[PDB]
Amino acid sequence: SIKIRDFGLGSDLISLTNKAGVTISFTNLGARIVDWQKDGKHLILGFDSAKEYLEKDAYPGATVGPTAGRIKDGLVKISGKDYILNQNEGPQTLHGGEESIHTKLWTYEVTDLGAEVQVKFSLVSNDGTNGYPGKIEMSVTHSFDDDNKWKIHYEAISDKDTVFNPTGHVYFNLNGDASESVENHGLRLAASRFVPLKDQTEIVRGDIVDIKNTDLDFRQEKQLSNAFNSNMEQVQLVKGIDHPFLLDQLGLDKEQARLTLDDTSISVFTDQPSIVIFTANFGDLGTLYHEKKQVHHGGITFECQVSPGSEQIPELGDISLKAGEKYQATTIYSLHTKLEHHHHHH
Amino acid sequence: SIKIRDFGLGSDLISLTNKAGVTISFTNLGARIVDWQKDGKHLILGFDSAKEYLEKDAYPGATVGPTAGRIKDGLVKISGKDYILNQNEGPQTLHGGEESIHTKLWTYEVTDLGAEVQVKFSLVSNDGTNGYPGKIEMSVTHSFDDDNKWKIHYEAISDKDTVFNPTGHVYFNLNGDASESVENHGLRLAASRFVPLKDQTEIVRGDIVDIKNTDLDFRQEKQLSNAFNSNMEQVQLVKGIDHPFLLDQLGLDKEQARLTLDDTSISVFTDQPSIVIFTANFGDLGTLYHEKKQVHHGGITFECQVSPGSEQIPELGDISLKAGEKYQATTIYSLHTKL
Ligand SMILES: OC[C@H]1O[C@H](O)[C@H](O)[C@@H](O)[C@H]1O
Ligand SMILES: OC[C@H]1O[C@H](O)[C@H](O)[C@@H](O)[C@H]1O
Ligand code: NA
């Protein structure tokens, strides 16, 4: 079943229910996921209206770009030239600049394929918007199927050589309550290295570091509390996790990460080289989600993209996009029940 | 009564019906007027869904900007510096460039005041968008009241010195049918001067001309057919009218123009200095409106704004907008039915 209704400010809420009775919802305001429920329980963080996103926090569940993450001094080099982008976090350009794509109303069309339903959102970033060369015709397809797979497929074409590396900003919290920390969740992640941050401004330090056998090593499943309790310098610097993890083996075919709570698991697949993990280190901010005050560590993202900092660490990749060349990316989040035995206490 | 329905592509259609039973409807796709009817008759041109506008012609009824009209070579000077805007008509920047504000989905809020209902649309134009310095936070409020007054009020604020001169692009056609020419309508317009066009590229020619006692003098009501059959080189150049007329007296209190057909009339009020009048000189194009094939001269606009061409004729005005200043504009289309 497919259902649509006004969500506020002119945005719509598109709600899907698959054959297994699992429901998921999206809005065209920032081509974003609003909710995902199983048995009446929220699997992710989200608000009840458009206004809330704009008044409380506009990133949760959104599509962010054109470049996800921080770009030191807002400086990028395009086909030989240096370009300065909108600077919204001090001298840094964070998540494409102020009033970016996550704040726009995208147009959309729904395609019903039976066992699969696709929601294709479109938007044009005009040439020069927030300093980005263009224009860039973008499209984000969110699809949900009978197999409980939520897939995100990105496509883009630019009239001019530019940069492009968007991502999906969903926050998971298997407790279904923002006021409950995700430290009770188990995490498995196929990554042996990470990118440390320079300082509080959160730009990259410049080096790549091996995390095997440290508190950030999740190759073998472990409780999140091990990280949160860590006194490692990087952890203390941001009061939790807020870093890019470099995947060891690439390819859409491999389960790169798995987040588990009791009988529920979320598996992560992607064709991108890294996953930026941010554990909502908001401290006492207490943003209200469904009338619940959010706690420090009350959520966790899995932002799959080319790691930020490629401007300083060329080894991370190249986010350039040549005029006329078609960009594509695919990330998938799949829901499973009883994939493993996870019975713990905190 | 107010009614909201899905207009396609995620866009909304907001319809307002006042005490008199007159119906006017808007869409957030381009903060635009879609229809206006009385007794089942359309007074303006419009389509039946969002896709139509995107496939056929995105200008009808839209809020166009940041700058309305043609800018020679896409060039503007801001604080003594040259800036090149997106060029979408040859080397000119027309109606703000490609994929401009008329094609974006604006957020909106409806305010029901009883005798009056307002629909406030908002959109943020990022700094650099199509070459325009910004951010420019813009709002366009469309309001309809029990006196049959459709009012448009614009407001904007920019973080940087830039340029700003939007307009409303509605096309009227009191015949209620696009296949019929507006040549039978009478027009009155309180303007004695006009701005001639250079040539077919439609950039301004450079001068300001007196229209007194010419085929373009409408100070005294007259049938459009007159102008339409004229031999003035300007009329011939464009095959109708496609020009800025300079208003004689400035101020919102004065009826600047009047469009009439039989018992029905439309009055125009604005706080702007000029009115650009375009008579849908599309030739054989034949765009379809409500299944009706549009004819040459099958519509007419009243684009109120600062005259295009101020980049070459300073006397026309100045469209600059200084950082931090609040821009405001108001235009009103008043419907009257004779008894
Ligand atoms: O709230 C936005 C959030 O987005 C990312 O995860 C960043 O790495 C965090 O530092 C933070 O800016
Ligand atoms: O179709 C849009 C229309 O906009 C204005 O009326 C112009 O002066 C015309 O030349 C035409 O471009
Ligand atoms: Na809607």
XYZ file of C-alpha atoms and ligand atoms in Angstrom:
710
model
C 0.000 0.000 0.000
C 1.056 3.577 -0.785
C -0.317 6.537 1.019
C 0.299 10.281 0.667
C -0.639 13.283 2.797
C 0.416 16.875 3.411
C 3.281 16.891 5.956
C 3.423 20.657 6.577
C 4.766 23.793 4.784
C 3.805 22.280 1.464
C 5.775 19.106 1.902
C 4.245 15.592 1.589
C 4.646 12.438 3.532
C 4.842 9.232 1.439
C 4.126 6.122 3.489
C 4.747 2.640 2.340
C 3.803 -0.741 3.848
C 5.273 -3.874 2.397
C 3.808 -7.364 2.410
C 5.435 -8.245 5.735
C 3.591 -5.290 7.346
C 6.763 -3.231 7.755
C 6.226 0.462 7.222
C 8.543 3.229 6.085
C 7.952 6.913 5.337
C 9.657 9.699 3.344
C 9.192 13.412 2.657
C 10.215 15.524 -0.372
C 11.575 18.114 2.027
C 15.272 17.216 1.610
C 14.444 13.753 -0.071
C 14.412 12.274 3.395
C 13.412 9.317 5.422
C 10.995 10.264 8.216
C 10.255 6.969 9.847
C 10.695 3.196 9.721
C 8.657 1.018 12.042
C 8.343 -2.612 12.962
C 5.597 -3.764 15.203
C 4.831 -0.205 16.235
C 8.403 0.565 17.184
C 10.561 3.264 15.632
C 13.847 1.923 14.211
C 15.096 5.479 13.393
C 14.943 9.022 14.721
C 12.443 11.442 13.159
C 9.858 14.179 13.778
C 6.150 14.417 13.269
C 6.031 17.392 10.926
C 8.031 19.391 8.455
C 8.246 22.400 10.731
C 10.130 20.414 13.350
C 12.914 19.550 10.988
C 13.310 23.196 10.102
C 13.105 24.360 13.649
C 14.995 21.647 15.523
C 17.460 19.941 13.293
C 17.278 19.747 9.589
C 19.803 16.886 8.984
C 18.103 13.790 10.393
C 17.266 11.363 7.656
C 18.042 13.780 4.856
C 19.872 13.557 1.643
C 22.949 15.869 2.170
C 25.187 17.406 -0.499
C 26.337 18.211 -2.968
C 29.309 17.225 -0.805
C 28.816 15.485 2.474
C 31.064 16.344 5.407
C 33.506 19.194 6.048
C 35.767 20.860 3.462
C 38.547 22.776 5.166
C 38.313 26.498 4.399
C 35.595 25.688 1.811
C 38.332 25.189 -0.747
C 38.252 22.724 -3.626
C 40.247 22.414 -6.766
C 38.384 21.883 -9.937
C 40.152 21.088 -13.177
C 43.039 23.194 -12.107
C 41.073 25.981 -10.540
C 40.555 26.692 -6.962
C 36.985 27.339 -5.892
C 35.638 28.700 -2.654
C 32.316 27.282 -1.500
C 29.801 28.622 0.892
C 31.286 28.616 4.391
C 28.707 27.700 7.042
C 30.732 26.324 9.919
C 33.365 28.828 10.664
C 35.656 28.817 7.571
C 34.499 25.296 6.751
C 31.878 24.290 4.206
C 29.762 21.698 6.025
C 27.291 19.488 4.154
C 27.256 21.690 1.032
C 26.823 25.074 2.774
C 23.970 26.950 4.315
C 20.380 26.337 3.178
C 21.488 23.380 1.148
C 19.666 20.568 -0.586
C 18.366 19.037 2.678
C 16.243 22.162 3.068
C 14.610 22.233 -0.362
C 11.341 20.751 -1.495
C 12.240 18.186 -4.251
C 9.683 17.157 -6.885
C 8.898 13.425 -7.022
C 7.190 10.555 -8.734
C 6.184 7.182 -7.324
C 6.644 3.923 -9.166
C 4.819 0.846 -8.093
C 6.478 -2.358 -9.085
C 4.491 -4.638 -6.861
C 7.084 -6.246 -4.609
C 8.979 -3.073 -4.781
C 7.937 0.570 -4.622
C 10.253 3.397 -5.747
C 10.111 7.060 -4.800
C 12.189 9.169 -7.136
C 12.958 12.701 -5.945
C 14.462 15.289 -8.304
C 16.215 18.586 -7.895
C 18.343 20.879 -9.920
C 21.269 22.616 -8.246
C 21.763 25.793 -10.381
C 25.184 26.695 -11.698
C 27.102 28.633 -8.960
C 24.702 27.684 -6.155
C 26.704 27.959 -2.856
C 29.801 28.332 -5.122
C 29.345 24.935 -6.875
C 29.912 24.875 -10.672
C 26.848 23.435 -12.455
C 24.153 23.011 -13.056
C 23.647 19.635 -11.653
C 20.538 17.668 -12.317
C 20.090 15.354 -9.373
C 17.898 12.511 -8.508
C 17.564 10.340 -5.412
C 15.556 7.156 -5.496
C 14.337 5.653 -2.243
C 12.869 2.191 -2.604
C 11.411 -0.363 -0.209
C 10.705 -3.964 -0.972
C 8.972 -7.076 0.244
C 12.337 -8.292 1.525
C 12.660 -5.371 3.980
C 15.386 -3.693 1.976
C 15.521 0.072 1.929
C 17.647 1.192 -0.950
C 18.995 4.593 -1.869
C 20.194 5.207 -5.391
C 21.822 8.469 -6.361
C 22.208 9.822 -9.912
C 23.662 13.095 -11.166
C 24.854 14.931 -14.299
C 26.567 18.329 -14.482
C 26.869 20.789 -17.323
C 30.280 21.751 -15.907
C 33.181 19.972 -14.178
C 32.313 20.079 -10.472
C 32.513 18.018 -7.244
C 29.835 15.512 -6.017
C 29.689 13.135 -3.022
C 26.339 13.199 -1.321
C 25.081 10.908 1.483
C 22.041 9.819 3.569
C 21.814 11.158 7.067
C 19.584 8.721 8.828
C 20.004 8.084 12.589
C 19.159 4.685 13.948
C 18.091 3.953 17.516
C 16.844 0.439 18.026
C 15.466 1.370 21.429
C 12.715 3.303 19.573
C 13.178 6.076 22.181
C 15.579 9.040 21.703
C 15.989 9.304 25.431
C 17.688 5.867 25.477
C 21.392 5.671 24.554
C 22.502 3.297 21.790
C 25.378 2.083 24.029
C 23.316 -1.100 24.455
C 23.558 -1.825 20.760
C 26.001 -4.282 19.242
C 28.110 -3.165 16.284
C 30.062 -5.072 13.599
C 32.075 -3.128 11.022
C 34.401 -4.326 8.295
C 36.956 -1.583 8.676
C 40.644 -1.716 9.830
C 41.473 1.995 9.527
C 40.019 5.376 10.336
C 40.621 9.086 9.693
C 41.446 11.095 12.804
C 40.375 14.696 13.197
C 42.669 17.565 13.800
C 40.786 19.270 16.668
C 37.369 20.601 17.671
C 36.819 22.165 14.294
C 36.630 18.634 13.037
C 38.717 18.945 9.873
C 40.899 15.938 9.084
C 44.208 15.559 10.801
C 46.110 14.494 7.680
C 46.921 10.847 8.435
C 45.192 7.436 8.308
C 45.389 5.235 11.291
C 45.129 1.523 11.963
C 42.541 0.774 14.730
C 42.967 -2.935 15.063
C 42.707 -4.050 18.657
C 41.745 -0.657 20.013
C 38.397 0.378 21.400
C 37.379 1.463 17.837
C 37.897 -2.027 16.412
C 34.512 -3.484 15.551
C 35.509 -6.178 13.083
C 34.142 -8.586 15.672
C 30.863 -7.505 17.130
C 31.009 -5.560 20.327
C 28.732 -3.297 22.430
C 28.854 0.392 21.636
C 29.561 1.182 25.242
C 33.172 0.014 24.683
C 33.649 2.909 22.371
C 31.746 5.440 24.472
C 33.659 4.488 27.539
C 36.908 4.818 25.746
C 39.456 7.415 26.855
C 41.306 7.268 23.549
C 42.239 10.805 22.391
C 39.967 10.707 19.380
C 37.009 9.615 21.379
C 37.525 12.230 23.996
C 37.957 14.864 21.372
C 34.415 14.527 20.073
C 32.800 12.808 23.082
C 31.816 9.713 21.167
C 32.318 8.781 17.533
C 32.339 11.224 14.589
C 34.692 9.744 12.052
C 35.201 8.240 8.707
C 35.967 4.530 8.756
C 37.750 3.102 5.667
C 36.121 -0.180 4.491
C 38.518 -3.007 3.993
C 36.748 -4.703 1.070
C 34.680 -2.803 -1.486
C 31.549 -3.890 -3.307
C 27.832 -3.767 -2.983
C 27.799 -7.528 -2.402
C 29.395 -7.395 1.077
C 27.738 -6.739 4.432
C 29.904 -3.828 5.595
C 28.187 -3.113 8.889
C 25.561 -4.586 11.180
C 23.761 -2.844 14.085
C 21.953 -5.215 16.471
C 19.606 -4.930 19.430
C 18.022 -8.088 20.866
C 16.226 -9.821 17.971
C 16.605 -6.909 15.515
C 19.416 -6.154 13.112
C 20.157 -3.580 10.486
C 22.663 -4.561 7.762
C 24.517 -2.021 5.694
C 25.591 -2.424 2.080
C 27.110 0.145 -0.213
C 29.287 0.708 -3.232
C 31.093 3.661 -1.498
C 34.625 3.368 0.076
C 33.833 4.576 3.564
C 31.271 5.068 6.347
C 31.201 8.157 8.496
C 29.856 7.233 11.901
C 28.385 9.925 14.218
C 26.838 8.950 17.492
C 24.788 12.065 18.282
C 27.291 13.549 20.735
C 24.904 16.395 21.560
C 25.420 16.291 25.316
C 22.620 17.904 27.174
C 21.046 19.654 24.117
C 18.025 17.406 24.564
C 16.269 17.857 21.181
C 12.721 16.483 21.557
C 11.848 13.501 19.326
C 8.223 12.463 19.773
C 8.062 14.268 23.108
C 11.200 12.450 24.311
C 14.339 14.431 25.209
C 17.174 13.047 23.225
C 20.169 11.848 25.280
C 23.844 12.193 24.448
C 24.523 9.095 22.193
C 20.841 8.802 21.481
C 21.392 7.787 17.846
C 23.952 6.596 15.313
C 24.430 7.281 11.605
C 26.038 5.231 8.794
C 26.849 7.903 6.170
C 28.255 6.005 3.236
C 30.312 8.162 0.892
C 33.808 8.932 -0.253
C 35.604 9.893 3.021
C 35.771 13.584 3.741
C 39.268 15.206 3.698
C 40.206 13.959 0.231
C 41.265 17.545 -0.318
C 44.153 16.975 2.124
C 44.457 13.178 1.843
C 44.418 12.345 -1.793
C 44.529 8.654 -0.996
C 40.917 8.846 0.222
C 39.669 9.256 -3.341
C 38.601 11.874 -5.929
C 35.172 13.462 -5.802
C 35.391 15.315 -8.957
C 32.633 14.941 -11.454
C 33.301 15.659 -15.113
C 30.880 17.491 -17.209
C 28.518 15.085 -18.941
C 29.642 12.129 -16.878
C 26.938 10.278 -14.985
C 27.419 9.911 -11.283
C 25.861 6.933 -9.471
C 25.898 5.587 -5.938
C 23.983 2.907 -4.137
C 23.526 2.304 -0.435
C 21.257 -0.238 1.174
C 19.933 -0.743 4.620
C 18.268 -4.083 5.273
C 16.128 -5.219 8.174
C 16.408 -8.640 9.699
C 15.005 -10.438 12.637
C 16.932 -12.987 14.704
C 20.009 -12.886 12.511
C 22.016 -13.611 15.667
C 21.949 -14.094 19.420
C 22.158 -10.785 21.131
C 21.184 -10.814 24.790
C 22.888 -8.312 26.971
C 22.350 -5.989 29.847
C 23.557 -2.513 30.607
C -13.692 28.252 1.526
C -10.155 26.950 1.057
C -9.224 23.669 -0.579
C -5.801 21.965 -1.013
C -5.117 19.198 -3.407
C -2.123 17.449 -4.998
C -1.224 19.207 -8.267
C 1.335 16.631 -9.453
C 5.084 16.054 -8.989
C 4.636 16.686 -5.254
C 3.224 20.189 -5.951
C 0.045 21.590 -4.275
C -2.978 23.361 -5.603
C -4.511 25.859 -3.169
C -7.988 27.041 -4.172
C -9.794 29.949 -2.648
C -13.490 30.739 -2.977
C -14.707 34.040 -1.517
C -18.184 35.164 -0.483
C -19.082 36.085 -4.047
C -18.313 32.595 -5.235
C -15.352 33.654 -7.279
C -12.604 31.017 -7.395
C -8.823 31.628 -7.612
C -6.189 28.960 -7.276
C -2.406 28.825 -6.824
C 0.398 26.403 -6.853
C 3.675 26.344 -4.875
C 5.384 25.288 -8.045
C 6.769 28.746 -8.818
C 4.415 30.667 -6.359
C 2.028 30.928 -9.206
C -1.530 31.666 -10.173
C -3.127 28.736 -11.930
C -6.711 29.830 -12.465
C -9.252 32.460 -11.796
C -12.955 31.887 -12.554
C -16.360 33.434 -12.321
C -19.493 31.585 -13.325
C -17.451 28.765 -14.762
C -15.400 31.045 -16.926
C -11.641 31.228 -16.799
C -10.292 34.765 -16.798
C -6.652 33.835 -17.176
C -4.586 31.163 -18.919
C -3.425 28.070 -17.057
C -2.910 24.350 -17.180
C -4.456 21.407 -15.482
C -1.375 19.951 -13.737
C 2.212 20.594 -12.758
C 3.723 18.480 -15.535
C 2.058 20.694 -18.106
C 3.816 23.716 -16.934
C 7.126 21.927 -17.021
C 6.602 20.489 -20.420
C 4.792 23.242 -22.207
C 5.577 26.630 -20.841
C 6.763 27.339 -17.363
C 6.129 31.063 -17.335
C 2.335 31.424 -17.291
C 1.138 32.748 -13.944
C 4.565 32.448 -12.295
C 6.644 34.592 -10.003
C 9.745 35.235 -12.248
C 13.053 36.559 -11.022
C 15.240 37.449 -9.324
C 15.192 39.856 -12.211
C 12.279 39.942 -14.613
C 12.976 40.627 -18.287
C 16.013 40.554 -20.498
C 19.462 41.578 -19.378
C 21.867 42.411 -22.222
C 24.733 39.900 -22.368
C 23.737 38.699 -18.840
C 25.790 41.646 -17.452
C 25.108 43.690 -14.303
C 27.357 45.953 -12.310
C 27.265 45.559 -8.533
C 29.179 48.012 -6.369
C 31.263 48.849 -9.470
C 32.044 45.183 -10.316
C 30.835 43.308 -13.332
C 28.867 40.145 -12.784
C 27.782 37.661 -15.483
C 24.438 35.933 -14.893
C 23.286 32.636 -16.326
C 22.606 33.129 -20.033
C 19.523 31.331 -21.240
C 18.452 33.176 -24.392
C 21.429 33.525 -26.559
C 23.786 35.843 -24.576
C 20.942 37.378 -22.646
C 19.768 36.531 -19.192
C 15.936 36.235 -19.515
C 13.739 35.980 -16.385
C 16.649 35.128 -14.088
C 18.296 32.391 -16.207
C 17.630 28.720 -16.675
C 15.821 26.612 -14.109
C 14.967 29.742 -12.186
C 12.584 30.450 -9.280
C 9.521 29.824 -11.428
C 10.431 26.144 -11.563
C 11.108 25.559 -7.944
C 8.693 24.239 -5.283
C 8.232 26.937 -2.682
C 7.249 26.282 0.884
C 3.962 27.936 1.928
C 1.549 28.786 4.672
C -2.106 29.727 4.422
C -3.598 32.448 6.721
C -7.422 32.704 6.858
C -8.550 36.099 7.839
C -12.202 35.596 7.030
C -12.884 38.309 4.462
C -9.357 37.764 3.225
C -7.155 34.692 2.892
C -3.452 34.882 2.396
C -1.015 32.330 0.989
C 2.593 33.137 1.821
C 5.174 31.396 -0.301
C 8.896 31.332 0.669
C 12.085 30.447 -1.070
C 15.763 30.983 -0.436
C 17.991 31.762 -3.371
C 21.510 30.617 -2.378
C 24.430 32.939 -2.751
C 25.835 32.402 -6.342
C 22.671 30.861 -7.755
C 22.749 31.507 -11.502
C 25.420 34.070 -10.723
C 23.385 36.186 -8.338
C 25.068 37.282 -5.103
C 23.000 36.345 -2.044
C 21.511 34.557 0.028
C 18.212 36.195 -0.756
C 15.370 35.158 1.398
C 12.239 35.847 -0.639
C 8.513 35.720 0.098
C 5.582 36.268 -2.169
C 2.165 36.531 -0.686
C -0.858 35.969 -2.877
C -4.070 37.127 -1.232
C -7.759 37.007 -2.289
C -10.650 38.840 -0.610
C -14.364 39.244 -0.581
C -14.112 42.328 -2.800
C -12.629 40.322 -5.661
C -9.143 41.768 -5.080
C -6.171 39.606 -5.897
C -3.111 41.112 -4.368
C 0.582 40.165 -4.626
C 3.054 41.374 -2.096
C 6.759 40.751 -2.422
C 9.459 40.948 0.188
C 13.191 40.082 0.164
C 16.363 40.400 2.160
C 19.842 39.704 0.967
C 23.067 38.975 2.810
C 24.995 40.777 0.064
C 24.576 43.632 -2.377
C 22.772 42.202 -5.380
C 19.927 42.998 -7.805
C 16.257 42.256 -7.424
C 13.198 43.034 -9.545
C 10.726 40.229 -9.777
C 7.286 40.205 -11.447
C 4.096 38.201 -11.785
C 3.595 36.597 -15.179
C -0.171 35.955 -15.385
C -1.818 36.076 -18.855
C -5.393 37.310 -19.002
C -7.967 36.270 -21.622
C -11.435 37.324 -20.840
C -12.714 35.212 -23.679
C -12.044 32.261 -21.340
C -10.580 30.402 -24.321
C -6.969 30.436 -25.696
C -8.075 29.752 -29.249
C -9.549 33.266 -29.284
C -7.581 36.447 -29.686
C -7.699 39.298 -27.066
C -8.018 41.653 -30.006
C -11.645 42.254 -28.938
C -10.667 43.511 -25.467
C -10.410 47.150 -24.688
C -7.411 48.478 -22.860
C -6.784 51.676 -20.931
C -3.293 52.445 -19.683
C -2.022 55.574 -17.902
C 1.293 55.744 -19.715
C 2.512 58.300 -22.257
C 6.037 56.836 -22.878
C 7.440 53.493 -23.936
C 10.805 51.702 -24.278
C 11.516 50.566 -27.830
C 13.357 47.378 -28.663
C 16.587 47.205 -30.637
C 15.646 44.221 -32.833
C 14.491 40.673 -32.729
C 16.814 39.851 -29.827
C 14.481 42.095 -27.895
C 17.152 43.942 -25.966
C 16.369 47.602 -25.394
C 17.241 50.004 -28.053
C 18.542 52.849 -25.902
C 15.842 55.536 -25.926
C 12.602 56.446 -24.342
C 9.826 57.393 -26.694
C 6.729 59.432 -26.440
C 3.635 57.478 -27.510
C 1.191 60.289 -27.388
C -1.238 60.118 -30.314
C 0.210 56.933 -31.720
C -1.291 53.481 -32.078
C 0.178 52.659 -28.708
C -1.540 55.448 -26.858
C -4.144 53.847 -24.546
C -4.542 56.694 -22.195
C -8.120 56.639 -23.541
C -9.743 53.269 -23.636
C -9.266 51.496 -27.008
C -9.535 48.108 -28.695
C -6.444 46.070 -28.903
C -7.188 45.418 -32.514
C -6.005 48.908 -33.192
C -2.591 48.323 -31.870
C -2.658 44.903 -33.450
C -3.246 46.274 -36.927
C -0.816 49.070 -36.585
C 2.115 49.677 -38.949
C 4.482 51.223 -36.402
C 7.818 49.555 -36.871
C 7.866 48.568 -33.141
C 4.560 46.653 -33.495
C 5.729 45.052 -36.645
C 9.054 44.119 -35.203
C 7.488 41.833 -32.643
C 4.101 41.141 -34.248
C 2.109 42.644 -31.422
C 3.187 44.216 -28.158
C 6.216 43.163 -26.079
C 7.219 46.365 -24.346
C 7.693 48.309 -21.157
C 5.340 51.241 -20.760
C 6.345 53.984 -18.371
C 3.543 54.946 -15.977
C 2.652 58.642 -15.743
C 1.854 58.752 -12.003
C 3.418 56.549 -9.368
C 1.452 55.160 -6.410
C -0.696 52.195 -5.394
C -3.849 54.288 -5.136
C -4.213 54.884 -8.860
C -5.765 52.583 -11.446
C -2.838 52.241 -13.848
C -4.459 50.011 -16.364
C -7.820 48.538 -17.236
C -8.634 45.496 -19.293
C -12.240 45.183 -20.435
C -14.462 42.806 -22.325
C -18.209 43.373 -22.209
C -19.559 43.362 -18.607
C -16.260 42.228 -17.177
C -13.273 44.296 -16.315
C -9.815 43.955 -14.710
C -8.112 46.850 -12.975
C -4.388 47.039 -12.221
C -2.748 48.836 -9.261
C 1.004 48.736 -8.452
C 3.670 50.577 -6.636
C 6.075 49.896 -9.487
C 7.070 52.406 -12.214
C 6.498 50.314 -15.248
C 4.273 47.736 -16.795
C 5.591 45.338 -19.411
C 2.866 44.285 -21.761
C 3.219 41.097 -23.813
C 0.406 39.952 -26.163
C 1.371 36.232 -26.592
C 2.880 36.739 -30.006
C 3.480 32.976 -30.445
C 2.467 32.634 -34.037
C 1.526 29.063 -34.966
C 3.028 27.557 -31.853
C -0.443 26.477 -30.767
C 0.359 25.526 -27.137
C -2.624 23.679 -25.671
C -4.652 25.205 -22.853
C -7.475 23.031 -21.574
C -7.367 21.145 -24.806
C -7.665 24.416 -26.726
C -4.942 25.379 -29.170
C -3.591 28.828 -28.375
C -3.714 31.445 -31.051
C -1.331 34.265 -31.769
C -2.416 37.080 -29.448
C -4.295 34.502 -27.388
C -3.403 36.269 -24.109
C -1.950 39.449 -22.535
C 0.261 40.162 -19.562
C 0.656 43.094 -17.189
C 4.143 42.545 -15.754
C 4.552 45.271 -13.137
C 8.167 46.065 -12.285
C 11.065 48.415 -12.858
C 11.563 48.554 -16.676
C 14.021 46.139 -18.168
C 17.038 47.780 -19.762
C 18.072 49.958 -16.827
C 21.554 48.595 -17.391
C 21.648 50.779 -20.549
C 19.090 53.509 -19.621
C 19.702 54.590 -16.072
C 16.817 56.998 -16.123
C 14.640 53.883 -15.925
C 15.586 53.137 -12.415
C 17.938 51.102 -10.309
C 17.330 47.500 -9.411
C 19.990 47.243 -6.807
C 19.364 45.730 -3.474
C 21.833 46.539 -0.705
C 22.810 43.979 1.878
C 20.443 44.115 4.787
C 17.805 46.234 3.103
C 14.261 45.045 2.966
C 12.789 45.029 -0.537
C 8.984 45.439 -0.832
C 6.537 45.548 -3.756
C 2.822 45.299 -4.291
C 0.624 44.735 -7.290
C -3.149 44.299 -7.406
C -5.551 42.801 -9.886
C -9.090 43.895 -9.100
C -12.055 42.082 -10.742
C -15.254 44.033 -11.497
C -18.517 42.997 -13.009
C -20.919 45.446 -14.318
C -24.563 45.654 -13.375
O 24.525 17.225 12.848
C 25.306 17.044 11.642
C 26.389 16.001 11.870
O 26.717 15.453 10.557
C 27.887 14.591 10.527
O 27.716 13.293 11.082
C 29.078 15.291 11.109
O 30.275 14.534 11.008
C 28.772 15.639 12.548
O 29.909 16.298 13.126
C 27.601 16.616 12.574
O 27.896 17.849 11.957
O 7.252 33.799 -22.691
C 7.712 34.708 -21.691
C 7.620 36.138 -22.189
O 8.035 36.942 -21.068
C 7.906 38.353 -21.336
O 6.536 38.661 -21.606
C 8.802 38.691 -22.535
O 8.897 40.088 -22.839
C 8.360 37.953 -23.791
O 9.260 38.303 -24.877
C 8.411 36.445 -23.492
O 9.743 35.928 -23.415
Na 1.292 18.057 -1.343
